[PDB]
């Protein structure tokens, strides 16, 4: 009955940072999918296993939006088998990944002169995340053989690193805003479908 | 009291192999970005792979398919495999850690690799 | 891709003089930038790292300044010892570039 609330997440005024991604779950709603893929505003729109013009006449269970910050370097990153800094320890796509990876230039909103650094990437993790595993932790990382106890120093790291956008960096250095829908189908009645 | 330590340069003859060994201590490389650099005589720095702690690798494309880079966490040494070894391969190979964001603060002493017949 | 130009490629300066050894990224790259000397028959020693850090065991006559495209290390007084090449790298890069390298001579 009621509209999908997309807007929510799209236009929103603030996002998350990559290692502190934000997910939204959208569920009993009726979704304008035509509101998305005829816009005239994303540099990446992406779909894996599913078509965007022929999304309206299919039902799911729920729908997922995970929205964050990103380097247009990065963006390349959020995709099925990828690897790298973001995949590896910030956010990770499966392999059999359904859905949409949407992308828009926001060095508009998200750069500042000196630099903005409100938005922060994992930069140091043992191993690599699962698929849409989270860590926001903030543990100093031991890099040596000796351990570090929450003392940053020499083989002691703090695991977050910040961006730094400024608005005259080249483009892969600039802040791209990313929306990934997520598409579960369970063997449950559906709650989100197209008109 | 951190050091890298590295052998395996040897000469070696052209499509050959040789595998490259880099010993670590008081730097954990299981732990850290670790880097192979090699400098061919007189010219400039040439990154060519990197291993990430949680174990991804990538390559520069002029070895990308003939070098391998792995890393043994018991004995805390990180090893290059080259295949297939080209003259334009003959170098000065060295390790380093990545601090990160491809500054490298340690370094090793290297180990020389000449591809001749 | 960006491209690192490094220049002079050679420099003569005298024991005492103020040196400035410029590198040039095609477009902004913030404050991603290394700096390393290299001196004959050794690896490379890490000197500056984000544009401006001086890298701890580094004497503090060599410094780094800059943001975006234009990056300078300074040697504001050179020692006989300062014979080296001088590298800058690109920081936070898929491809770890180099600059082609700056060799400082001394004026004797």
């Known amino acids: 009955t009621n509209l999908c609330p997309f807007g929510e997440v799209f236009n929103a005024t603030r996002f998350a940072s990559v290692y502190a991604w934000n997910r939204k779950r959208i569920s009993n709603c009726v979704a304008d999918y035509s509101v998305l893929y005829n816009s005239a505003s994303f540099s990446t729109f992406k779909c894996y296993g599913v078509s965007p013009t022929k999304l309206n006449d299919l039902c799911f269970t729920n729908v997922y939006a995970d929205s964050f910050v990103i380097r247009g370097d990065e963006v390349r990153q959020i995709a099925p088998g990828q690897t790298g800094k973001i995949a590896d320890y910030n956010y990770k796509l499966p392999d059999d990944f359904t859905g949409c990876v949407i992308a828009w230039n926001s060095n508009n909103l998200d750069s500042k002169v000196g630099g903005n650094y409100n938005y922060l990437y994992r930069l140091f993790r043992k191993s690599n995340l699962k698929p849409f595993e989270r860590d926001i932790s903030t543990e100093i990382y031991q890099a040596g053989s000796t351990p570090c106890n929450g003392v940053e120093g020499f083989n002691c790291y703090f695991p977050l690193q910040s961006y730094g956008f400024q608005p005259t960096n080249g483009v892969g250095y600039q802040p791209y805003r990313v929306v990934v829908l997520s598409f579960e189908l369970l063997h449950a009645p559906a709650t989100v479908c197209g008109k | 009291e951190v050091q890298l330590l590295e052998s395996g340069g040897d000469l070696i003859q052209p499509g050959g192999s040789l595998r490259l060994s880099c010993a670590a201590s008081?730097?954990?490389?299981?732990?850290?970005?670790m880097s192979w650099v090699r400098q061919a005589p007189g010219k400039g720095l040439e990154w060519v792979s990197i291993?990430?702690?949680?174990?991804?690798?990538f390559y520069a494309d002029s070895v990308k398919g003939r070098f391998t880079i792995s890393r043994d966490n018991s004995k805390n040494t990180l090893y290059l495999q080259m295949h297939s070894l080209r003259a334009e391969d003959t170098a000065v190979y060295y390790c380093?850690?990545?601090?990160?964001?491809?500054?490298?603060?340690?370094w090793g002493k290297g180990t020389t690799v000449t591809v001749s017949s | 891709d960006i491209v690192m130009t490094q220049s002079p490629s050679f420099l003569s300066a005298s024991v005492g003089d103020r040196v400035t050894i410029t590198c040039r990224a095609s477009?902004?790259?913030?404050?991603?930038l290394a700096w390393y000397q290299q001196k004959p028959g050794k690896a490379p020693k890490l000197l500056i790292q984000?544009?401006?850090t001086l890298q701890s065991g580094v004497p503090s006559r060599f410094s780094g300044s800059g943001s975006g495209t234009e990056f300078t290390l300074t040697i504001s007084s050179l020692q006989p010892e300062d014979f080296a090449t001088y590298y800058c790298?690109?920081?936070?890069?898929?491809?770890?570039?180099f600059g082609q390298g700056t060799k400082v001579e001394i004026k004797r």
């Open positions: 291993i990430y702690p949680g174990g991804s690798t």
């Open positions: 380093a850690r990545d601090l990160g964001s491809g500054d490298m603060d340690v």
């Open positions: 008081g730097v954990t490389v299981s732990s850290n970005y």
């Open positions: 477009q902004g790259i913030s404050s991603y």
């Open positions: 790298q690109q920081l936070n890069s898929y491809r770890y570039t």
């Open positions: 984000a544009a401006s």
